[PDB]
Amino acid sequence: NLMKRCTRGFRKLGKCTTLEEEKCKTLYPRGQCTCSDSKMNTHSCDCKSC
Known part of the structure; x- marks a missing residue:
């Protein structure tokens, strides 16, 4: 268990954008x-x- 594939190196954009959740x-x-953002673009x- 553990260690899946969270992000491909952190590179999504558009405040939890669809393309990001996709x-x-x-x-x-x-x-x-799923889509995860802090407080930026x-x-x-x-x-x-x-």
Whole structure:
């Protein structure tokens, strides 16, 4: 278990943008993966606590 594929090096954009949530979904077949952002214009995935 553990270690999935959270982000492909942190490179998503558009405040939890669709293309971002899609990046994590279409590319990563996880159950705990999705769109994750802090408070900027760029964010990434969080399928794995990284």
